[PDB]
Amino acid sequence: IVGGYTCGANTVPYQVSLNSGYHFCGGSLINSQWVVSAAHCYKSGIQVRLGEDNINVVEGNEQFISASKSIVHPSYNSNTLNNDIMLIKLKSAASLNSRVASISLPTSCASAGTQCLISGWGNTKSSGTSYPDVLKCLKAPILSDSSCKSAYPGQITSNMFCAGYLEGGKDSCQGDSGGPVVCSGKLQGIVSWGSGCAQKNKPGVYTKVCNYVSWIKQTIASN
């Protein structure tokens, strides 16, 4: 997260870190045994880390649970990043509490202008590289479809939305990938892509989660 703020330990209780020897992506806990992330975060050997603030220090609220299976969306295209969504099942159910909690799926799509919370352990620099240990947060509005399409000609599908600031300075970045965009207590987006970070006229692009609720529910119901 570039130009954000330190969230505070366990203030974003649905935020997960995906770890394969190191943090490589964010995710969102949607029930005791399932995590939503980006399809571009797919790899083998994933351990889900819940209750994290400082990802380099065991602070006492963590739960570390290996993934039993990952399910990339059947229509995910890695070139265009269309349908950039994946489900991860935990080998055992997380113990839910005030610091490790699920986030609700949307019942409706959030509109442009809606104010949301984006979070992650991604790069905090727009030019350099600096990775934080503690969770960073950014309040950002959803942008209009037209402004999103004008920012990225030929690249925005009906499964994507832009959020952030056209002036730059405040954005998600590498390592925030797969993490949450939450609006009114619902998971509306997944950190998907962009062009650099916090650059003028290049806001973050996010997977439009409301399009996938039926797939998520049916997949969970049979897996």
Ligand SMILES: NCc1csc(-c2cccs2)n1
């Ligand atoms: N600025 C949006 C965004 C989200 S993930 C991301 C990057 C991934 C790799 C380099 S940059 N950029």
Ligand SMILES: [Ca+2]
């Ligand atoms: Ca920790």
